[PDB]
Design an enzyme around this catalytic site. Structure first.
Site, PDB file in Angstrom:
ATOM      1  N   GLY A 124      48.707 -15.715  38.031  1.00 13.02           N
ATOM      2  CA  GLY A 124      47.195 -15.511  37.117  1.00 13.02           C
ATOM      3  C   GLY A 124      46.558 -17.229  37.138  1.00 13.02           C
ATOM      4  O   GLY A 124      46.699 -18.145  38.328  1.00 13.02           O
TER       5      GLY A 124
ATOM      6  N   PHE B 160      46.112 -19.700  34.867  1.00 12.64           N
ATOM      7  CA  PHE B 160      47.082 -20.630  34.356  1.00 12.64           C
ATOM      8  C   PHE B 160      48.913 -20.462  34.657  1.00 12.64           C
ATOM      9  O   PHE B 160      49.680 -19.673  34.106  1.00 12.64           O
ATOM     10  CB  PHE B 160      47.700 -20.121  32.853  1.00 12.64           C
ATOM     11  CG  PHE B 160      45.730 -19.932  32.204  1.00 12.64           C
ATOM     12  CD1 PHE B 160      44.881 -18.895  32.775  1.00 12.64           C
ATOM     13  CD2 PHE B 160      45.135 -21.275  31.951  1.00 12.64           C
ATOM     14  CE1 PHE B 160      43.425 -19.133  32.178  1.00 12.64           C
ATOM     15  CE2 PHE B 160      43.971 -21.399  31.484  1.00 12.64           C
ATOM     16  CZ  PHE B 160      42.958 -19.863  31.220  1.00 12.64           C
ATOM     17  N   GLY B 161      48.974 -20.386  36.074  1.00 15.97           N
ATOM     18  CA  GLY B 161      49.696 -20.332  37.097  1.00 15.97           C
ATOM     19  C   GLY B 161      50.334 -19.181  36.902  1.00 15.97           C
ATOM     20  O   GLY B 161      50.455 -18.194  36.736  1.00 15.97           O
TER      21      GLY B 161
ATOM     22  N   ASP C 158      41.309 -15.297  22.606  1.00 15.75           N
ATOM     23  CA  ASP C 158      40.599 -14.570  24.015  1.00 15.75           C
ATOM     24  C   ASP C 158      41.289 -12.849  24.301  1.00 15.75           C
ATOM     25  O   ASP C 158      42.320 -13.036  25.689  1.00 15.75           O
ATOM     26  CB  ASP C 158      41.721 -15.969  25.384  1.00 15.75           C
ATOM     27  CG  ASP C 158      41.033 -15.281  26.492  1.00 15.75           C
ATOM     28  OD1 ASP C 158      40.171 -15.035  27.384  1.00 15.75           O
ATOM     29  OD2 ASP C 158      42.191 -15.869  27.533  1.00 15.75           O
TER      30      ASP C 158
END
EC number: 2.7.11.30
Lengths: 326, 107
Positions: free
Chosen positions: A40, A42-43, A159
């Site tokens: 993704g 984010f890592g 989110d």
């Protein structure tokens, strides 16, 4: 016994959602990574095993140290153990003299996100209601302040999106990724908002967020913004309800009115100026289940946050619907 | 680093070696006295293998000095604990930790 049993046995008034401080490192360091599951924004997310048991490990990259921190901080300071909220196990900071590595360990769910699931499968009316009902329950659980020892302050996600909802093997969902969440500490009328260079995914941002008018001093504003996003999620799901072979291809909200990777400005034109919403097919009005979903979507999409439905209410009207169809 | 102050003497000679599993009972507090973790409250001893870094540096080096049966206060500085980051929700950044540790046995 399981990691979940363990989390329960080691629970003490004062403990967080997962394992005790020191036990977290014990387990994090003993986990055997198996396969990269997803890479993704984010890592990476890896499937890992702990003494044989499958677990999920999200390894964050330098830039989301703040997302890693907030998600862990929330699961730790807020008691979050619910069947519709991704089960937190442990967080770990494994910095080798070569490169720091931020870990987040949680339950494992093979299906992945609602996004992956909906791309892979069409769904049944019953399947739709299961997905939507459970999503609303999870969100209603987050938004709710529960009094007592086993209590919990209210939390706003910030989110919500297909990609941040996971679907279990029993066809149910659980909300994940609390890296931008805000806590309401009614005990001081304050809103705990953590610092991050990151902000919500733009296509799911509510009108008030897109135009900056959202009053960030009122917690309700955050819940209302989540509702708008949950509504788009319901649209993504309904779009895949297949009845007698008819359904749509999977699509993200506003896929037709906006470029991929939309900017705040582009979303703003469509949602605030043009006041457009995802299209609700006329055919959904015939079939009662889609008609209720469609009505919920609209109640989630008003420009005026205060006229939107509440997560609890959606939970309720969805419960009524679920009993009128076995 | 870490300071070890004995509270109660151990056998004086059985010190954990790399590879062995230490079984202990602890209670961690911040300098101001607020507890943040305690295997005692759980009524279940905590276990870790010395050398595999399953615990902070101040522990791996602090417990390597108690002998079986010993009970001591380990005062650990930030660079030997959770440093600048601290631990989200539990341990403040740059925190000096104080542990009450008892090495029950080795395995």
């Amino acid at each position: 016994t399981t990691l979940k049993d363990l989390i329960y046995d080691m629970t003490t008034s004062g403990s967080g959602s997962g394992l005790p401080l020191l036990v977290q490192r014990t387990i994090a360091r003993t986990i055997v990574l198996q396969e990269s599951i997803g890479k993704g924004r984010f890592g990476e997310v890896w499937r890992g095993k702990w003494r044989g048991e499958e677990v999920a490990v999200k390894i964050f990259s330098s830039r989301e140290e703040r997302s890693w921190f907030r998600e862990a901080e929330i699961y730790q300071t807020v008691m979050l153990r619910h069947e519709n909220i991704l089960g937190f196990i442990a967080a770990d900071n494994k910095d080798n003299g070569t490169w720091t590595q931020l870990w987040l360990v949680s339950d494992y769910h093979e299906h992945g996100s609602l996004f992956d699931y909906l791309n892979r499968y069409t769904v049944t009316v019953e399947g739709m209601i299961k997905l939507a009902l459970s999503t609303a329950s999870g969100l209603a659980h987050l938004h709710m302040e529960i009094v007592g020892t086993q209590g919990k302050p209210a939390i706003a996600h910030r989110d919500l999106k297909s990609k941040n909802i996971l679907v279990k093997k029993n066809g149910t969902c659980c909300i994940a990724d609390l890296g931008l969440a805000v806590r309401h500490d009614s005990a001081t009328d304050t809103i705990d908002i953590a610092p991050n260079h990151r902000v919500g995914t733009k296509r799911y941002m509510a009108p008030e967020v897109l135009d900056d008018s959202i009053n960030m001093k009122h917690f309700e504003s955050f819940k209302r913004a989540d509702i708008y996003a949950m509504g788009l999620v319901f649209w993504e799901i309904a779009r895949r309800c297949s009845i007698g072979g008819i359904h749509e291809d999977y699509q993200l909200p506003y896929y037709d009115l906006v470029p991929s990777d939309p900017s705040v400005e582009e979303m703003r034109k469509v949602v605030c100026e043009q006041k457009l919403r995802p299209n609700i097919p006329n055919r959904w009005q015939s079939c009662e289940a889609l008609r209720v979903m469609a009505k919920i979507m609209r109640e989630c999409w008003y420009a005026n946050g205060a006229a939107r439905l509440t997560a609890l209410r959606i939970k309720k009207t969805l419960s009524q619907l679920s009993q009128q169809e076995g | 680093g870490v300071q070890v102050e004995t509270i109660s003497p151990g056998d004086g000679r059985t010190f954990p070696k790399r590879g062995q599993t230490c079984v202990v009972h602890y209670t961690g507090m911040l300098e101001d006295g607020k507890k943040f973790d305690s295997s005692r409250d759980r009524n279940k001893p905590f276990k870790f293998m010395l050398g595999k870094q399953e615990v902070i540096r101040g522990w791996e080096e602090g417990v390597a000095q108690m002998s079986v049966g010993q009970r001591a206060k380990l005062t650990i500085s930030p660079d030997y604990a959770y440093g600048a980051t601290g631990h989200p929700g539990i341990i403040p950044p740059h925190a000096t930790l104080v542990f009450d540790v008892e090495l029950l046995k080795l395995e």
